[PDB]
């Protein structure tokens, strides 16, 4: 019920999608997106630091974390907590590195607020095929457990 | 009004405090705490990576990010956004490294969910005196701007 309650707050439903996915000046392929919410979306990383490295971003392009409205802060953060639960179940881990590079001097390369979620294990470039496969595994799991 | 609205959601008021501040097996000195909310608190770091390095944690000891309730996730994350605004104004920066080491394999050393907020600038141990001084500067600024 905790995660089902978060999904209700995120206004999620199976197959919810956006017509387009903007990330800074870039456009994310719909095949790489595993979840869309009222204000955010989650997509697989083309340059993962480690396996299962995912990104969460706002549907509206906003550069800094402090540019987000209260509703967007809640949305992206409830999605983060929900995705750590999903990734935890999929990658068989309880440990994650969660981070925002909020600005150029924090290492931000794309001018659009995003959260990194990286599954972590002891002593730990991708094609559209591998990315679609990874996004499909995540999307399939969300659908199976949450309707 | 955005930040005043967040403070209302955090149930904050000038001088709001807790009888005790637990952080894992450790206890944080009240002099090092700059803000207390309905579910969280913010305190200055005794081993800062860079100047202005602060920590946010839950008042209730919870090990993993996924142990938090919906109300706690919202509280700690609205406080994070609010504190990036405050620290931004105090340390004269728009850039921050924001992170959760969610578990031992992510480098967590204290078994209690916490967010790191580190102000960042181009090409960037503390005594109770220095820590009290830093917490006082933060607390004084919050009070001045938000009542």
């Amino acid at each position: 019920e905790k995660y089902k309650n978060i999904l209700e707050k995120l206004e999620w439903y199976k197959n919810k999608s956006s017509e387009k996915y903007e990330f800074g000046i870039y456009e994310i392929d719909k095949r790489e997106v595993f979840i869309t919410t009222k204000y955010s979306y989650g997509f697989v990383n083309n340059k993962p630091l480690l396996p299962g490295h995912i990104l969460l971003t706002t549907l509206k392009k906003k550069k800094h974390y402090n540019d987000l409205d209260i509703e967007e802060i809640i949305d992206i953060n409830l999605l983060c907590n929900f995705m750590c639960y999903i990734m935890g179940n999929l990658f068989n881990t309880t440990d994650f590195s969660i981070a925002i590079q909020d600005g150029k001097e924090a290492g931000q390369t794309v001018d659009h607020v995003h959260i990194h979620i990286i599954p972590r294990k002891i002593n730990d470039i991708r094609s559209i095929e591998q990315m679609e496969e990874e996004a499909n595994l995540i999307k399939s799991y969300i659908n199976e457990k949450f309707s | 009004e955005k930040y005043k609205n967040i403070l209302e959601k955090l149930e904050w008021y000038k001088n709001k405090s807790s009888e005790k501040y637990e952080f894992g097996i450790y206890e944080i000195d009240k002099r090092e705490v700059f803000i207390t909310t309905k579910y969280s608190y913010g305190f200055v770091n005794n081993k800062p990576l860079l100047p202005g390095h602060i920590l946010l944690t839950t008042l209730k000891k919870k090990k993993h990010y996924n142990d938090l309730d919906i109300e706690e996730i919202i509280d700690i994350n609205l406080l994070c956004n609010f504190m990036c605004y405050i620290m931004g104004n105090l340390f004269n920066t728009t850039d921050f490294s924001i992170a959760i080491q969610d578990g031992k394999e992510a480098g967590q050393t204290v078994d209690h969910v916490h967010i790191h907020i580190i102000p960042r600038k181009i090409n960037d141990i503390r005594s109770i005196e220095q820590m009290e001084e830093e917490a006082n500067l933060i607390k004084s600024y919050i009070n001045e701007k938000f009542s």
Partner: peptide, 7 residues
């Protein structure tokens, strides 16, 4: 950034 994951 650039010394640990993920700073």
């Amino acid at each position: 950034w650039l010394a640990f994951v993920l700073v």
